[PDB]
Amino acid sequence: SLQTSFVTLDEAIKITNRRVNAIEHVIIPRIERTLAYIITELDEREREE
Amino acid sequence: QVWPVRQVRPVTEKLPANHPLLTGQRVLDALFPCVQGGTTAIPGAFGCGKTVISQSLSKYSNSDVIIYVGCGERGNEMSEVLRDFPELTMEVDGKVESIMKRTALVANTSNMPVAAREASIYTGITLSEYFRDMGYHVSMMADSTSRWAEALREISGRLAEMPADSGYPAYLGARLASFYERAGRVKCLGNPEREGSVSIVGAVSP
Amino acid sequence: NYLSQPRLTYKTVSGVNGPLVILDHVKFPRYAEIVHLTLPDGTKRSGQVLEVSGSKAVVQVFEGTSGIDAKKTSCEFTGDILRTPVSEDMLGRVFNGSGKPIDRGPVVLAEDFLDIMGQPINPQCRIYPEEMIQTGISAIDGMNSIARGQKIPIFSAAGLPHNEIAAQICRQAGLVKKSEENFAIVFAAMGVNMETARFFKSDFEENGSMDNVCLFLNLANDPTIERIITPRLALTTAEFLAYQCEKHVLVILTDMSSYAEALREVSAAREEVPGRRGFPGYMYTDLATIYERAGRVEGRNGSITQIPILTMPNDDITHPIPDLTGYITEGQIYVDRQLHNRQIYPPINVLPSLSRLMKSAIGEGMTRKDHADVSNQLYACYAIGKDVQAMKAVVGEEALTSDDLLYLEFLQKFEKNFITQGPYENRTVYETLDIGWQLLRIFPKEMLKRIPQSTLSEFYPRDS
């Protein structure tokens, strides 16, 4: 019971730590680059107007 | 005498900065030293505790004269500076003396004329350059250069100028560069041979 | 002394365009002068000189330009700018946004006439803020406490109860009554719909507080210049009451977001180009001219404290109106859509809220010695309670420790007893602090790490 738990629990930690890393290194930076582009383009439209 | 705030006061020579601007703090003075004639920035924000810089410069630095500029500050913040500074003291030749014997304050709240809030650092640096020319070492503190830049932006808006970076006028970076280029150690104009300096600390609010 | 000369009346209208009438042959035109127009049918309107150039003046009419023509319309130039009569008889009165009475009382006998533009207070004469203004609302008085001479906005959004909160502050506000008739309120409301305006007028009469209050109402379909004038009449009154009659004045300015909409319109009528985000480039210097009419001054026993109230689009704090207000004022009280949806009132969120002068208002001789410690510990428990409540949905309630279950009990009882309060329930700061201790007593006294041992010894135990 301890070894079937331990081997099943080790897998779920790896999958979870991979999501914490992917959100920190891949997903959040893509949102921040998008959001920085939008602000830059809205300054352009304002200067054209 | 009378001098234009936007003209740099002339010197025989401008010199490299060699001597520390000591503050009496162990950090700062050891790990992150400034020179006499140097330039420094600090973050201007509520909780951080700016007053240790201002009060260590005023009480304990090897400056001969202090110039402080408020340049569009909140009314209750400016009131705190103008209350506190007269109460600061230092020990000279075994006698306690007021900080206001070697200090001048420029003070501007957010409802003063926008022309004053923008002129403020040019008034404060021109006062600093006048005591440099006597052969004193001066520290100048600007309480927030972000409030100065917002006044410069409002003036360009009144003039209907092209809005460039984030609505700030095209010259913003040149105005900041030309201002901080007035810091330094110098060989003064005129006959009795002497050296002075002006060191600038400018707070900024990202 | 007096102005003495007879008035000139002109029938020299050159043109009419939008809100503006243009006249020529005017004798030495004065900028910002008030003028009276009489229409062809005998109707009367008034306006202000918006620009002068040689013999030409252009007048912005407050009412419409409809029915005006170049032949029969006459304009009478009064010789002077806008000045308001002012007196202590203005407490207990209701006025419109031009200072005209709307309460069936008579027109004001002046103790003085003042220029509504005022003058800036000298930085040498302003002394630092001090004791509390007691609003009667626990989320403000207990944790975002307001000093005499502070300026602190309420940040809100459309459909949230910020007018019900403003009305409750107006009914309940005063000094702390430790161990006064020297307290007054000026209430100003800009761009108010008739339902909201009837509520303010009715609620202050019905709940019998008018003897402390001067009320200025500007409705959503009043002239947009009266909205520009409204904060200036209110603050010109607060300056007479505070710095000549020595009162502590509370000023409530309602929708500075409505004020900015009128400012943008007067700017457009001058044919200026729209500034950053569509507001005038000078909107900081304009808002600072309202908000810095505040403080304590040397040698006079009165003060002015301001509570601006603002509505934000998209619930976005980064819009020019709340953003420029943040650079001038010293704190924020934040009104929250989620607490409102959860049926909590007043829906004030204490985690993003801050009063930057709270340490100057509270403590021994100003409130009670434990106030700072109780405020720090209630904030610390609530910030942990919201974090335990989040992990409970991840780990399940059987994985929570006994200490997590204490924070989970505190969180529920804090929101039901401290934050939740009636719209006609008034708590002193002492009652607020006692409700604060009833909640802190949920914990073993070892948990209360923000409170020193001396405060725990005097206040943690119950007593007969």
Swiss-Prot record, chain C:
Record's CDD domains? ATP-synt_V_A-type_beta_C, ATP-synt_V_A-type_beta_N, V_A-ATPase_B
Q: In which tissues is it expressed?
A: Expressed in brain (at protein level).
BP terms from Gene Ontology: ATP metabolic process; regulation of cellular pH; synaptic vesicle lumen acidification; vacuolar acidification
* Primary location: membrane
Annotated ATP binding lies at R356
Q: Name one Pfam family in it.
A: ATP-synt_VA_C
What is the membrane topology noted in the UniProt record heading this document? Peripheral membrane protein
Entries under PROSITE patterns matching the protein: ATPASE_ALPHA_BETA
Superkingdom of origin organism: Eukaryota
| A GO term from the CC aspect | clathrin-coated vesicle membrane
Q: Where in the cell is it found?
A: Apical cell membrane; Melanosome; Cytoplasm; Cytoplasmic vesicle, Secretory vesicle, Synaptic vesicle membrane
What InterPro entries does UniProt report for this protein, alphabetically?
A: ATP-synt_VA_C (IPR055190), ATPase_a/bsu_AS (IPR020003), ATPase_F1/V1/A1_a/bsu_N (IPR004100), ATPase_F1/V1/A1_a/bsu_nucl-bd (IPR000194), ATPase_V1-cplx_bsu (IPR005723), P-loop_NTPase (IPR027417), V-ATPase_su_B/beta (IPR022879)
The molecular function terms of the Gene Ontology recorded here are: ATP binding; proton-transporting ATPase activity, rotational mechanism
Q: Keywords for this entry?
A: ATP-binding, Cell membrane, Cytoplasm, Cytoplasmic vesicle, Hydrogen ion transport, Ion transport, Membrane, Nucleotide-binding, Synapse, Transport
ATP-binding keyword on record: yes
Q: Could you tell me which SUPFAM superfamilies the record lists for this protein?
A: P-loop containing nucleoside triphosphate hydrolases (SSF52540)
Q: What does this protein do?
A: Non-catalytic subunit of the V1 complex of vacuolar(H+)-ATPase (V-ATPase), a multisubunit enzyme composed of a peripheral complex (V1) that hydrolyzes ATP and a membrane integral complex (V0) that translocates protons. V-ATPase is responsible for acidifying and maintaining the pH of intracellular compartments and in some cell types, is targeted to the plasma membrane, where it is responsible for acidifying the extracellular environment.
Q: Which family does it belong to?
A: Belongs to the ATPase alpha/beta chains family.
The protein's matches in HAMAP family, at most eight in alphabetical order, are given as: ATP_synth_B_arch (MF_00310)
Subunit-structure text:
V-ATPase is a heteromultimeric enzyme made up of two complexes: the ATP-hydrolytic V1 complex and the proton translocation V0 complex. The V1 complex consists of three catalytic AB heterodimers that form a heterohexamer, three peripheral stalks each consisting of EG heterodimers, one central rotor including subunits D and F, and the regulatory subunits C and H. The proton translocation complex V0 consists of the proton transport subunit a, a ring of proteolipid subunits c9c'', rotary subunit d, subunits e and f, and the accessory subunits ATP6AP1/Ac45 and ATP6AP2/PRR.
Q: What is this protein called?
A: V-type proton ATPase subunit B, brain isoform
What is the protein's species of origin?
Rattus norvegicus
Q: What is the lineage of its organism?
A: Eukaryota, Metazoa, Chordata, Craniata, Vertebrata
Q: Which gene encodes it?
A: Atp6v1b2
